[PDB]
Symmetry: C5
Subunit: 311 residues, 5 copies
């Protein structure tokens, strides 16, 4: 078994199609996702042509090892791909129709800058190395590129599954490569993040600000230190769900900024008490009275600025 010869010097066009059956396990930390799909290949092998009449059939079936199959590989698969062939059909002129059912753990990077409001473009790269006799080029048969209606990704909205029709042509180890880009467009379902992380995080911060309506140092220290600890718990919880990025994520920025607010509240609480002990509650009163407006205003403005910078 060896590649089909070119009539002229033409390259061999393998028509591809990925049809998603299942989407699952989008792992944020690992930047991987698992897929269950149909891979369809179609090419011209003249050596396998036949006359419909003298055969008694309009189409012929084959076993994988009986005929030449192009070595289509996945560029970005974590766990060594396992594939079982479902059908091989040969039409009169020698057109092969390959159909396999595969499943792989695809590794595609994610952009966490707008987390948890972010949207992602997942990739599946098909590749084919050209052989000694002739060159192999990939093409997309848009007719066999889809995803079923049932397909759901847990915690994500599946927008589209398209393929970049023009393959990327290049050389690797003095050999011609044909690479294709299948793109899964998804957007994160941020709903749950609101009552589970964002709102509890805001509540504990507002609770900390009640120290602005209290003259009790011992109570203020308990209010501010306690809420700060609860904020550390939320910070830790958030950072366990995410990988370590070389940039600031939106949630990350908000969380980091809230530390500054706790820190300044501590300073204020400290200052107010210090002045009170030094017998000048009048200066302490005015700093506390300002704080009651200042913190909410500055917090709100800081957030407006951040949202602007990030969106």
């Amino acid at each position: 078994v060896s590649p089909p010869p070119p009539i002229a010097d033409e390259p061999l066009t393998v028509n591809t199609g990925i049809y998603l059956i299942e989407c699952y396990s989008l792992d944020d930390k690992a930047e991987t996702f698992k897929v269950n799909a149909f891979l369809s290949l179609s090419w011209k092998d003249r050596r396998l042509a036949f006359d419909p009449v003298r055969s008694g059939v309009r189409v012929k079936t084959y076993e994988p090892e009986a005929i030449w199959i192009p070595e289509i590989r996945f560029v970005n698969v974590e766990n060594a791909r396992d594939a079982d062939v479902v059908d091989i059909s040969v039409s009169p002129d020698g057109t092969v129709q390959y159909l396999e059912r595969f499943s792989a753990r695809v590794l595609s990077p994610l952009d966490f800058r707008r987390y948890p409001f972010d949207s992602q473009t997942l990739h599946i790269y098909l590749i084919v190395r050209s052989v000694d006799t002739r060159n192999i080029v990939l093409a997309v048969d848009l007719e066999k590129v889809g995803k079923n209606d049932d397909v759901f990704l847990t915690g994500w909205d599946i927008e589209s599954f398209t393929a970049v029709v023009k393959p990327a042509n290049f050389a690797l180890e003095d050999r011609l490569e044909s690479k294709l880009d299948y793109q899964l467009r998804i957007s994160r379902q941020y709903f749950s993040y609101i009552p589970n992380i964002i709102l509890p995080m805001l509540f504990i911060l507002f609770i900390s600000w009640t120290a602005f309506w209290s003259t009790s140092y011992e109570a203020n220290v308990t209010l501010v230190v306690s809420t700060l600890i609860a904020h550390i718990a939320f910070n830790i919880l958030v950072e366990t769900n995410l990988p370590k990025t070389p940039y600031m994520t939106y949630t990350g920025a908000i969380i980091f900024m809230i530390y500054l607010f706790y820190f300044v509240a501590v300073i204020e609480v400290t200052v107010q008490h210090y002045l009170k002990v030094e017998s000048q509650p009048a200066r302490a009163a005015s700093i506390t009275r300002a704080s009651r407006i200042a913190f909410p205003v500055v917090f709100l403005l800081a957030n407006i600025i951040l949202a602007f910078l990030f969106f």
Copy 2:
């Protein structure tokens, strides 16, 4: 080996039956469950017929590769479903009786809206792609569809295992597909949720309300902030056992609402102290006196409204 010819233009009916041997590992976060079962296939292959009077043997045994077997696949499976063929029996008439023992990690979505009081309908979809020569259609032999009595799914009650008898016949990639729906009806054993999460969560909330019977700001801040922290621990613990949903779960709603109660208890505690310092304990006394009745009443009513909206 190739499909049996139709006498007429008729499609081939493959009779299916799934008999559950074991149910295990219902993972809520992943929305998967593992199964260990018997798959039985039965169809008409005229090429394998024989006379019963002359043959001597009433039933003929075969090895898988010796005869044509229809490619029955599972739609919603994760881990490759290993299959061990246990027996192949041919009727003298030509009827085939296939029996395999399989095991798979099945991926079926779950509805967490009523958690931990929810009930689920797990699916196992069988599929068969039609071949070149003739079309294949699936059917249910209710006689070979069951589950053994021993079958238990840890933390769940197994209600029923039925199959939707009418297959979903549709065209995919210019070929006809026959899909069958086996349904496992299960309901969650909520018992453990009561003394482990629900009651401790209520106790800490009631402990927080004792601040309505004390004039000590320092003690009230310790009561309300501490219990609030313990409530965050329960919230975190609960949300780790569940996937991120684009909707509110029942437990989620209760938990979120309790934050509002803590927040308002802080405001009250703050107000009471502020008035006390301002030398008007009379207004503070009446706000506190109201709070005792108000809090339990409103909490109770709120719960009734929520349980109503959810059930």
Copy 3:
């Protein structure tokens, strides 16, 4: 290859023997355990009989695929059995001696009612489906059922490994089935639970009771709320090591009851302070004096009652 014919209409007796090599990974949450053992099968195949004299040898070695081997399957195994044939020997008269080395992740339910003082009966069910020519029945050769002396289970005491000699006989999907029951009797090593969970849990509760020798509301609130939080930590830690049961476990009951003791100490602490503020320390003194004896006595009685109900 097909089953040996009955001289008469008699069923075929397959003699089974399991010798445990290793026991490991008893997973409480999953209710599974892993095993490494020898499986021995022995049956009469008349077709391979011989005369010890003319054949030249009294023993005859064989390869698996060369002769008919009965399809002995494991019922309750999660991880798809992988079997290595170590030896196949044929006696002159035609008796076969099969010996395989297997390893499986066995799924067997556990009774957590007396946890961590519980004892368990783990099961390994061998099964054999009868074929169309003749019926197959299982039997135990007590001579080949054991476990080596080195066999240990981490955190458990291995009491006995016996097999129920009389096999179950039943019909499944119109064919006869022979199931056996191998039983591994184990008891939990509760030792570590005493200084790691039980004693720290008791200490924090006794620490909570020192509030009965204090008139300081602010100190009492700190004592009772703090220890209650530490009790939540122990509760959470315990419930992570166990699956969600539809019943109350012993540890579970004790833990749940201790919440009531915290709750009532809060009420007491609240009452004492309230009376003190209302200028009646005499009533408060007598309530606190009573609590000093009541709390320990009631706790002790409650425990005796529980231990009685559970053991």
Copy 4:
């Protein structure tokens, strides 16, 4: 393929050699470790004797299935027969030189009594069951038993890799078994345990003892209760890294003992306050003055005793 004939009643000697390439993943909880090594087997098969002149080669090479290979099995593994034959060399006399690369998850119990100062003796047991025709006995070729210099075990010091030269010959299920014991001697690198667990644990305990220089009940309750909670965190963290033992580990004993110190510190703090309220600060003063010396002294002695009992 069948075993070599005994030229006389003599058993067959298979010479073994394990050469460690990699050591990794010593899992304390599971009591397992993973290994990557060379297994070398060498025995005499006279049936494979040849003439270097006639066959035109000084050494013959073979494929595994072409010749008889003794079934050498690993006793204490979970690994499930992973490997690759690197070479098979047969010299003219019939000496076979088998060399395979293997990797396994060996399961060997650990002694946690002196943790984290403990040393362990890991085992790899090779076994061979004797066949029908003749008996097989194992032997160690000390020349082929080693470990490369690069071999490192994360968090452990590798002392020696020797093999017990005399095999353990015994009877199992009516056949002769030859067992070999390869021993990996390792000692735990306790360094990290000092600044991560031991010193922070001592610091929080000493912090608790400052309550012996304070007359403030509210401050003492905060000191002792808080540090006790931090001690629970360390206890939990430690017990997650260890399996549940039926004995007391060194760390376990220290940790358990520190609970008694917290408990008695609470009693003291309680007593001191009670006396103060009762208007006898003189008795309280003498109890607190004693406590300062008492606690350090007793703690120190208790530790001298434990280190003595354990080492």
Copy 5:
């Protein structure tokens, strides 16, 4: 199939080349990383030579088992290397061009001394054991050693992928071995460590130092003990991301040192109160006044010293 004979007594040179397709899962605790790459082998087999003109084809293709392939094996790999042969090409002169696509979990130790500012040199060791007929030696074809532009390692910067050109030739078990060192140079992206661990850790420490501007013992005990607990949380969080080293890591040193600062702050807070009670607030005032300057200064000095010692 056997090794090609030397014209002279010369050793056989196998030219190697590793071309990284993907880098993923650098596990700090396990000291492993996963790789997806091309392995290219090239050697001279005179037995496969032929005429370019008379033969008619310039290059001839072969299947793996048809020709002799040198047994090139990876030293430091965990999961069995999965090899998919992509192409085998023979030059007319008899040179072979092997190209496989492999993926492995590589075990390479890491230096945590400068964590999280550390840089690592990952290794991939290729090895070849010489055979009985002739010796095999490895060499690097720098032309086929690279990594694609897309290659990214999450949380790391990929510096370079070079190979040490001179093989390490040594004797192991009487046969000669040729080992090659491919080196992946990477540096850790420390960015995220700054707002997630380092800055929150500094903030809580500065918050603890406000006790130097307070005379309230009860508030100081709450400030210092609370922040100390938050520091333990950060310590625990950090040590879960790292393996147990026999040395001090940079972060480890900083973290350990901060415990000393908390401890001395406790002593100060204790001293100040003790003096206040003893009616000497003048000595207490001067100790706190000194502490206000000493703590920040000594902290700043100590850090400079540490960074010096570590960088």
